[PDB]
Amino acid sequence: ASLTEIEHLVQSVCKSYRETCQLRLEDLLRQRSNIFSREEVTGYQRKSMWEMWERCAHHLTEAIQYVVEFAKRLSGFMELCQNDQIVLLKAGAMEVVLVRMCRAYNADNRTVFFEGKYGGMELFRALGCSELISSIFDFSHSLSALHFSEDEIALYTALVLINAHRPGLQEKRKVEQLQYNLELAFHHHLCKTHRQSILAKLPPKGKLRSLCSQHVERLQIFQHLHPIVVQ
Numbered sequence: 001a002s003l004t005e006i007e008h009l010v011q012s013v014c015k016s017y018r019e020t021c022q023l024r025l026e027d028l029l030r031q032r033s034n035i036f037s038r039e040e041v042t043g044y045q046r047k048s049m050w051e052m053w054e055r056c057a058h059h060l061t062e063a064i065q066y067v068v069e070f071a072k073r074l075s076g077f078m079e080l081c082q083n084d085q086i087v088l089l090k091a092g093a094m095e096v097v098l099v100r101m102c103r104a105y106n107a108d109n110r111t112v113f114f115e116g117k118y119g120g121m122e123l124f125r126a127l128g129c130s131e132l133i134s135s136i137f138d139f140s141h142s143l144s145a146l147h148f149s150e151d152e153i154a155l156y157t158a159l160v161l162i163n164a165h166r167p168g169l170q171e172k173r174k175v176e177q178l179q180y181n182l183e184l185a186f187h188h189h190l191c192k193t194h195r196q197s198i199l200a201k202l203p204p205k206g207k208l209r210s211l212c213s214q215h216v217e218r219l220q221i222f223q224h225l226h227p228i229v230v231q
């Protein structure tokens with residue numbers, strides 16, 4: 001490994017992200033003025049918890065499909081064994097979705113893009129998950145204050161996936177090497193772009209894991225009762 005390799009890694013991660021980012025940031029930004037009316041919000045608040053679960057499931061499986069397309073474009077990732085790829089995605093794909101959410105979050109009015117328009121947390125009322133919804137909003141809010149560039153999101157979410165602390169990895173050392181190369185690529189790119197100051201503002205160690213845990217615990221509860229997810 002060396003610095004020209006590290007530069008090509010940055011270019012390459014950031015390219016995979018652009019190809020798998022789901023919606024272009026500029027599309028998400030321009031859609032900010034498209035907000036659910038009070039009548040639309042009400043129509044959402046009236047759905048059963050089951051219908052909202054269906055809609056959130058569909059929303060998430062579609063976000064996860066881009067994250068899997070992202071991983072599969074990653075340099076080091078396809079060279080990892082079949083088991084390690086599965087262990088990393090199972091543990092990290094939802095964490096990556098939680099990070100990616102900040103692009104579709106508008107801090108000025110605390111709304112998120114969901115099914116074609118922006119709406120506030122109250123849109124999700126019928127779920128009966130207001131503690132967890134409001135943690136997810138807070139997490140998005142605090143990432144949103146960093147004003148992440150696409151390439152920064154690209155590198156940070158790559159680091160979210162390639163984490164050698166996942167239990168059940170068989171080639172731990174190989175995942176370690178790719179993790180440390182990504183961490184170094186991230187630092188390097190921050191220096192190139194005079195953005196070192198964001199390292200201190202990243203979510204503390206374990207805030208993401210624990211939020212994702214609580215998120216998935218709740219999905220598993222809806223799933224055991226209305227199994228809408230397949231595989």
Ligand SMILES: Cn1cc(C2CCN(C(=O)C3CCCCC3)CC2)c2cc(NC(=O)c3cc(C#N)ccn3)ccc21
Nearest residue numbers: 021022023056101104105112113129132136137140218
């Ligand atoms: C903060 N926050 C919360 C939400 C939704 C997620 C689903 N929910 C659940 O899974 C649970 C919540 C708890 C219990 C089960 C259901 C309910 C709450 C959300 C969506 C977005 N939107 C995009 O990322 C987005 C990005 C793209 C792109 N590119 C395209 C479309 N949307 C942004 C911020 C968000």
